[PDB]
Amino acid sequence: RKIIDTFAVLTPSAVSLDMRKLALGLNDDSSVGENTRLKVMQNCFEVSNPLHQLQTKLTIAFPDKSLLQYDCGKLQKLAILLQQLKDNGHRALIFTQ
Amino acid sequence: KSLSLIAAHSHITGLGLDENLQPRPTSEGMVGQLQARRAAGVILKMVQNGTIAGRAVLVAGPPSTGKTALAMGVSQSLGKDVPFTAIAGSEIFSLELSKTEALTQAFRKSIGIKIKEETELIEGEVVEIQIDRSITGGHKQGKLTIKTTDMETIYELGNKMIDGLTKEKVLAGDVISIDKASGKITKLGRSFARSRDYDAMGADTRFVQCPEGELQKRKTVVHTVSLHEIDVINSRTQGFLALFTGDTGEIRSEVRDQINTKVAEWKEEGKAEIVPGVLFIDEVHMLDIECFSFINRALEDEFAPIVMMATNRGVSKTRGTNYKSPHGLPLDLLDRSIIITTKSYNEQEIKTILSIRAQEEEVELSSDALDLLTKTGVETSLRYSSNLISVAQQIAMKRKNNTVEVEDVKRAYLLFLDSARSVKYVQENESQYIDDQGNVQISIAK
Amino acid sequence: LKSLSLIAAHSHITGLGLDENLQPRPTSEGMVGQLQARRAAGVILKMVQNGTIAGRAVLVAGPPSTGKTALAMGVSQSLGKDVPFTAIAGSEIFSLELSKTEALTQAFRKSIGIKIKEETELIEGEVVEIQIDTGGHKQGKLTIKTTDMETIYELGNKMIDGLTKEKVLAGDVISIDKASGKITKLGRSFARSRDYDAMGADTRFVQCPEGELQKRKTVVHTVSLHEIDVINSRTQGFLALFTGDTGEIRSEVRDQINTKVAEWKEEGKAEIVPGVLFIDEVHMLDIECFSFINRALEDEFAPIVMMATNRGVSKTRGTNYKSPHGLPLDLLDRSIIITTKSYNEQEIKTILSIRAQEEEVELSSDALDLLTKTGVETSLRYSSNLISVAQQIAMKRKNNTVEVEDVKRAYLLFLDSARSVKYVQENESQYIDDQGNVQISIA
Amino acid sequence: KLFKKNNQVNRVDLDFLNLVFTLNDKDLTSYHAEEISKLTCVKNFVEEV
Amino acid sequence: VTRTAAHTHIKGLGLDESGVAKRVEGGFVGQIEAREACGVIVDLIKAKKMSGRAILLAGGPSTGKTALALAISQELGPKVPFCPLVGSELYSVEVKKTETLMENFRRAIGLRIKETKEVYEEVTELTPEENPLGGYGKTISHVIVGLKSAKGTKTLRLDPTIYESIQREKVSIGDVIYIEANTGAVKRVGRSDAYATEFDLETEEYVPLPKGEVHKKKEIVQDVTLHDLDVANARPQGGQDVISMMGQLLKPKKTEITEKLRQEVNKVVAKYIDQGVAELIPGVLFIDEVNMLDIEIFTYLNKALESNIAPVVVLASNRGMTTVRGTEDVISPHGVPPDLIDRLLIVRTLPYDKDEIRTIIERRATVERLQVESSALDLLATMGTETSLRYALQLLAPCGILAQTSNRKEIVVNDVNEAKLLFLDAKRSTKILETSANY
Amino acid sequence: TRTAAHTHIKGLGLDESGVAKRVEGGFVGQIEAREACGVIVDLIKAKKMSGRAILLAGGPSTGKTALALAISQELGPKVPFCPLVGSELYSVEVKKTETLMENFRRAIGLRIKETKEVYEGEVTELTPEVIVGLKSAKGTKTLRLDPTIYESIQREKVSIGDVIYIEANTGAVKRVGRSDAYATEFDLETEEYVPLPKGEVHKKKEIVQDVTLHDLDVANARPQGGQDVISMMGQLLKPKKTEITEKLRQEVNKVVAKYIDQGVAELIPGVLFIDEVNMLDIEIFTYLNKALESNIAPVVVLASNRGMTTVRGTEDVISPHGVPPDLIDRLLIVRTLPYDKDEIRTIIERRATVERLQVESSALDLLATMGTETSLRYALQLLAPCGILAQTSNRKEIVVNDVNEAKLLFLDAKRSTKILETSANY
Amino acid sequence: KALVEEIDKKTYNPDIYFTSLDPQARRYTSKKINK
Ligand SMILES: Nc1ncnc2c1ncn2[C@@H]1O[C@H](COP(=O)(O)OP(=O)(O)O)[C@@H](O)[C@H]1O
Ligand SMILES: Nc1ncnc2c1ncn2[C@@H]1O[C@H](COP(=O)(O)OP(=O)(O)O)[C@@H](O)[C@H]1O
Ligand SMILES: Nc1ncnc2c1ncn2[C@@H]1O[C@H](COP(=O)(O)OP(=O)(O)O)[C@@H](O)[C@H]1O
Ligand SMILES: Nc1ncnc2c1ncn2[C@@H]1O[C@H](COP(=O)(O)OP(=O)(O)O)[C@@H](O)[C@H]1O
Ligand SMILES: [Mg+2]
Ligand SMILES: [Mg+2]
Ligand SMILES: [Mg+2]
Ligand SMILES: [Mg+2]
Secondary structure, eight states: OHHHHHSOOOOOSOOOTTSHHHHTTOSSSOSSOTTHHHHHHHHHHHSOOTTHHHHHHTTOOOOOSTHHHHTOHHHHHHHHHHHHHHHTTOOOOOOOO | OOOOOOOTTSSOOSOOOOTTSOOOSEETTEESOHHHHHHHHHHHHHHHHOOBOOOEEEEEOSTTSSSHHHHHHHHHHHOSSSOEEEEEGGGSOOSSSOHHHHHHHHHHHTEEEEEEEEEEEEEEEEEEEEOOOOOSSOSOOOEEEEEOSSOEEEEEOOSSHHHHHHHTTOOSSEEEEEETTTOOEEEOSOOOSSTGGGSSSOSOTTTOOOOOSOSEEEEEEEEEEEHHHHHHHHHSTTOTTHHHHOOOOSOOHHHHHHHHHHHHHHHHHTSEEEEEOEEEEEOGGGSOHHHHHHHHHHTTSTTOOEEEEEEOOSSEEOTTSSSEEGGGSOHHHHHHSEEEEOOOOOHHHHHHHHHHHHHHTTOOBOHHHHHHHHHHHHHTOHHHHHHHHHHHHHHHHHTTOSSBOHHHHHHHHHHSBOHHHHHHHHHHTTTTSOOSSOOOOOOSOO | OOSOOSSOTTOSOOSOOBOTTOOBOSEETTEESOHHHHHHHHHHHHHHHHOOOOOEEEEEEOSSSSSHHHHHHHHHHHHOSSSOEEEEEGGGSOOSSSOHHHHHHHHHHHHOEEEEEEEEEEEEOBOOOOBOOOOSSOOOEEEEEOSSOEEEEEOOHHHHHHHHSSOOOSSSOEEEOSSSOOOEEOOBOGGGSSSOSSOOSSOOBOOOOOSOSEEEEEEEEEEEHHHHHHHHHSTTOTTHHHHOOOOOOOHHHHHHHHHHHHHHHHHTSEEEEOOEEEEETTTSOOHHHHHHHHHHTTSTTOOEEEEEEOOOEEEOTTSSSEEETTOOHHHHHTOEEEEOOOOOHHHHHHHHHHHHHHTTOOBOHHHHHHHHHHHHHSOHHHHHHHHHHHHHHHHHTTOSSBOHHHHHHHHHHSBOHHHHHHHHHHTTTTSBOTTSOOOOOOO | OOSTTSTTTSOOOTTTTTOOGGGTTSSOOHHHHHHHHHTTSOSSHHHHO | OOOBOSOSSOOSOOBOTTSOBOSEETTEESOHHHHHHHHHHHHHHHHTOOOSOEEEEEOOSSSSHHHHHHHHHHHHOSSSOEEEEEGGGGOOSSSOHHHHHHHHHHTSSEEEEEEEEEEEOOEEEEEOOOOOOSSOSSOOOOEEEEEOOSSOOEEEEEOHHHHHHHHHHTOOSSEEEEEETTTTEEEEEEEOGGGTTSSSOOSSOOOOOOOSOSEEEEEEEEEEEHHHHHHHHHSOOOOOSHHHHHHHHSOOOOOOOOHHHHHHHHHHHHHHHHTTSEEEEOOEEEEEOGGGSOHHHHHHHHHHHTSSSOOEEEEEEOBOEEEOTTOSSOEEETTOOHHHHHHSEEEEOOOOOHHHHHHHHHHHHHHTTOEEOHHHHHHHHHHHHHSOHHHHHHHHHHHHHHHHHTTOOEEOHHHHHHHHHHSBOHHHHHHHHSSSSOO | OOOOSOSSOOOOOBOTTOOBOSBOSSOBSOHHHHHHHHHHHHHHHHTOOOSOEEEEEOOSSSSHHHHHHHHHHHHOTTSOEEEEEGGGGOOSSSOHHHHHHHHHHHHSEEEEOEEEEEEEEEEEEEEOOOEEEEEOSSOEEEEEOOHHHHHHHHHTTOOTTEEEEEETTTOOEEEEEEEGGGOOSOTTOOSOEEOOOOSOSEEEEEEOOEEEHHHHHHHHHSOOOOSOHHHHHHHHHOOSOOOOOHHHHHHHHHHHHHHHHTTSEEEEOOEEEEEOGGGOBHHHHHHHHHHHSSSSOOEEEEEEOOOEEEOBTOSSOEEETTOOHHHHHTOEEEEOOOOOHHHHHHHHHHHHHHTTOEEOHHHHHHHHHHHHHTOHHHHHHTHHHHHHHHHHTTOSEEOHHHHHHHHHHOOOHHHHHHHHHSOSOO | OOSSEEEOSSSOOTTOOOEEOOSSOOOTTTTSOOO
């Protein structure tokens, strides 16, 4: 789990809806039976999936959280100074325009 | 339409001819090749007749003498609504399908059928939908109101189509088309009614619409489908997906026989028409003896389209065998076909072609520049000049002048080499390139 | 006529024509001549019927159309049913899904079968009229009736839990085992035929079974080793016994099956019947195939291998050198060769008469003599087909018997190989040459 | 819709006449089938006939 | 408005009752001996006795072998199967060539079967259903359904299972259905046409009422091939679970059908034949350019021909003394190994003559609906005799196009000359190919 | 930093007039080739032509691959650039022509603009139909959702009090995590906590994401759906790639043409580079000949170092650079010249200064003489062992002793062949 | 239907769908509409 969380990043560049459902023939209009399509979808929903987390990680990716501190030159020095100041029991007023 | 950048045959627009099948000296893109042009026109008329099947014509000649150009011309002059499948000989060898199956699919793709049906249609502006719940007296009490340009009328829904209009969020005040038998609802956008009510929607609705006529009429729907599409459709549960994924996988012969019988029954039942298009094969010498043997029999079938072939070589060794044959084709296949030959090109014809290419690539040429390009084309080749003319445009723009002069052409000639010059340079310094046996000298000294 | 054969190429042959002392009679059971080969084949048949010898290579060699395939067909017919006889050709070995060795191993495994017995007990005749009324569906009793027995059985919680699923209408003949298994639906009594007017897709009317309720039976199944391997290979491998996509069964399954068969034979539940693997046109086969056979012949689970070939000193496929019979000397060493000789005029005449008798064709004496003469000058199969062609000729002429005129018309209507070769040689220009040079134009 | 118009007019159900027997291995036993075949052959409808 | 392709001007062998071939009948001219031999062969095929006979036609290109085989197929009739193939068609990619050869071998013989069925067809009313008195939580004893039809109505009683099948179909009360009591399956034909205009719109097609008696007794006769049964058993279509339908979703690729399945199919077919229910009919397998076959398929043909239910195979070849493909030092006639040509019979086809070529050109012109002159026809015949028979037949159509362009209905000498100058043949192309620098 | 035989070349080093300076952009010499490459670069930037085909021919160690890389780097990251070798076209599951066409489609690009609608925040209620009562830090709104997105929600084991993040365009669902409000429920609770998102629950954004034609061709050729189990099993059903029918390509072309006509997207043709074209066979050459005369083909550049050799796949067809004459006829040839002593010395100096190494003048002259005597690549590669040998002696500057010891330790091709010929045991 | 749709939790009758050009914006049965 830890490895698959850390090293799964890439997502498809382009996706086309109404094609995943059409691949299996399970849609509103298809040559398969109207009720035969219901049995298989019910069975599939009852079927569990052990690869779900990989599916979530390979569809939408979030741009981390720490990089906000990393991506600004002033923020790193501000964090260092604030940590040093708090460890010594001080309080600060910040000013900006 | 069909957004494209440029093609080597972009200027060609449907051959060039008269009402008497006579070729003009210069018309619709191509020049010269009068006899070949008239032969292509005769073949085109034969194709348009549609009463003759399985004819093989082989266009042969030296390279760069209007062969693919002639094929593009006949394809364009044939127009749409008639299939034209152009394939290369090197794309039949596949790891998924046997060459026979690929050739059969190519043959079937080139013949189409038009299926005509008659359907009643209901069109007009809808102004209000009313929907009720489930009641003992009636399962669903729903009504629809339709406004045409001249009529307003009330329809009553019969417990199913309400699911049709609730499957997708539709709303009143727009023109829609609904089929009595099919039951499909097609929302064409938004009605006209009052301009202001739909003038602030942020474009959309496909430039709105206005009701035209009455409520219901009777129209004819024609569907054009290739035969190969029919075999793919009937082969599997969902073959229309295979029409894009390309995993048909050697459809069985029983399906093809059933398709043939049913299509014939339709044809003498008056329910469908047949359009026998054209199949064109470039670089036919790249095929195999097995493919030629299969073509020998596939040509004689009733549903055999007109086949055109393009080859360059003369008296070469056919692939899959060990003997030399003319055109790279076996004797029997040559006997089964009709040969159209092409000649070389005159200096005047080369100049006219270069001028056509110039006006096609929005490049202005001075008279002396065109003369120099024509001289180079006569000396070396047509395609070299047809490339130099485009490459000199950037050099011209580098001098901040749009017109192309002699200096630009000279610079392009001295910058980009040619086959003869490259061969001479290679033979002069063969010790630097990699030899046939793989011996190379890299050190400058000694 | 149990098989669907109309008329085979050699269907007149039913076993080898030999007697108790193994001496082959001059003509019996559809075989004529070839006394030495028939005697050798009878010895081979005795060896395979004995079942105490494993992995023997016998090779039948002779010029074409001398009875090698006929001899093997006679051996197979004389061996009788219940004994496997896997007949294949060389060209079938090369496959696009399995390697050559895998296909050879599958053929070897198919060649030998096993008889496995199974003892079971059943209860049949469940014309019940159940009696179930405490709480939770109490009163677990039901009756059982048949022709000679009738008794009431009490029920347990698990028994009624099984009964409620697959409901029994209390008037349908049902079966159940005492092996703590599943109660099996069998059918409905004839008394409930008139009740409805359109029966379902799973309802049948079986008569009331007779005898005793608790029956015990032994059933013997004849299964090849290859079938066992295929069944145990996958989750549902039995379907691959029809589709054929087994896919190179691994060695672990094979050795496990070998141990299982050894245990079954030791316990007396099964017995092995060896068979015969016959290979037509063994001359065309890769050096890899012969290399594999050289070692596969030495296994304990090895059948008797018969091979047929008609080549002289020819090149073996996959190599550059020439060997006798198109086989390496290493394989030829571990085999015994039965050689078939050419045919005599009288034997040819007798074979022609037998074949004509098989097709209900009445030949005149002179017609038969001319046919024998043609079959002596040309090959025998040419005349063998000419008899049927001439029978059709005569039938078109409204005459039952075939005469010399019909035979001569058939001879001049269909061409022998030698005449066709001569005509091709005399007209080389019209036919396509080896270099693809032809002269279509007549002038 | 056009092709599925003359289906039942010339179609014979292969499963009905025991021609697709390949699936009968799934839920049929040998001895039960033998007992059915024993208690199969007519001899009852003819009486009422 | 009828299409033609190198044929359709032949419609038989042109033989009288006695088997004598008329000179010009059925679209054929000449080739008396070959036509007589092919008529004898088709008579033997109609005899329905033999199994595995093999005929091979020999002759130069454009001599009538394919025409002879198509004439045999036309003479046989639509009922008897006729499977045509090219030699190169056997080299499949999905499965080994031997399997494809066996499949096409079995596709040639056919089987005509018959089956008698009862059926019931406007639904009037239906009532479902007694006391449990046992382990039945919910009991539906029987269902009463009434049908209207056209030639009188009738009601009946039917099992709960067919009622659940109806509920699966989910039919209404004013509908027309199709219930087959053989399999106990109900098919909803649709609504009733006379029940129209209940609502202003309705998607479902209303469909008229069934004609005749509701309780229909009928019999059906179908022609299939043993390959159809083999395919049906190898890849069954039944199944409701996920696995079966998802297997149906994958592309159907050919496999190696086992011998045991074929043996069981043969046993079942024989059992049905013995009852008189069905009868078998052998067909014909036709192969073009057998020289395209390699040594492996040629060897396997020996084993296949000597089988028990092999059909009649007709082979075509135009080569002379050539090396059999697949081996490098085996010179054989027609590119067929000596054993195979020892196993079959040979029919020779002779080259045509000037008058025969002229008559063929005239027949093709008549069947193409074209007008020609006697002088023009003579020039065309001389041209064909100078280059090839096929050249004139191919060149006929552009001559017609050129004639139509100048508003003239008859082919004339100048049109033929113009077509000659416009379109070349193999000989002139060969003569002008080597006399040039660039190929 | 990391260097690998390159990254000292930063462009063609041309001026506005197009005249190549003698030394500029990590380049020395090769003036004519650089000018021709700049002309080709301008032609590509014009975005008018289609299917133009040039190849640059010369001996080994002359800068052909360097020229192609410089062209790619000068074009810019905006323009797609597909590099390839001749041996990649021989795939296993698809034919060679299909792979070549796949690369052709991959070569050109399309820049499009799209609007994405997003919902996020804490979940208040979840009632089956699904109705979701989303609540942000300022707004609250209830939404109706499809069964598929409901199944994705269920597979995410979401519950009341979980800040989530739904995307409307694709249906992607991601549970951000437990809301910070319930931060006191278990002293060792494993679940992480996140503050409520800021702003209204519904937001819209405009993005300019780029794509390639092959990307949106394979998009509907085979899917990569996502979190739905049905889509997962559908994409698992077929694991192998397949040849794409021309009908799909035509439909893709029509859709892209409609998009660009609507003023929503623009088309940027790219370059396809093929190094060592001599590995191609006759069939691929013929198919490329056919495919060059198309209306969407990009600019293809080819590299080869061959004399008059036999085309692979043929027996006796000899041609220059191992390219069939018919394909040569529609080609533009760019010559490449060998180097001189001073050029070799300058290149060695540049490669030394990019690798942060100090080489004295005498050592540099010895290296230049060695490069002239043996090869340029050998002299370039012998720099690092010399640096390590200098470092081991606790020094920084390369000395004549260092290059002599490097010569002793490592051998070039000539001496290796000499010791190979004059030996008994192979 | 298009996935993800906004509702305001008021009314929201899945079996009642009323749409018009809003000239009166009144149901035909709002309060037994009659007299
Ligand atoms: N008659 C013509 N009119 C206009 N362009 C021509 C003509 N003949 C040849 N060309 C030019 O030649 C090129 C095509 O050469 P082509 O004849 O296809 O070579 P090949 O015969 O080797 O395939 C095209 O770019 C086209 O512009
Ligand atoms: N002793 C025999 N008895 C009956 N028929 C025979 C005998 N010998 C040969 N034949 C006939 O010869 C044919 C078998 O030829 P065979 O020698 O098997 O050819 P090949 O050697 O090519 O396998 C059969 O059709 C059979 O009728
Ligand atoms: N005796 C004949 N009568 C009429 N047409 C013939 C005759 N012989 C040949 N033909 C015609 O010649 C054409 C080509 O002959 P074909 O049978 O294809 O030669 P091949 O035997 O080499 O295949 C056919 O379309 C056929 O109609
Ligand atoms: N003008 C140049 N300036 C600097 N280095 C060059 C120059 N030309 C070639 N090189 C170097 O020569 C080496 C060989 O170049 P490359 O094009 O990759 O192979 P080849 O020249 O053999 O085709 C490259 O590592 C490159 O750094
Ligand atoms: Mg071309
Ligand atoms: Mg034999
Ligand atoms: Mg033929
Ligand atoms: Mg390089």
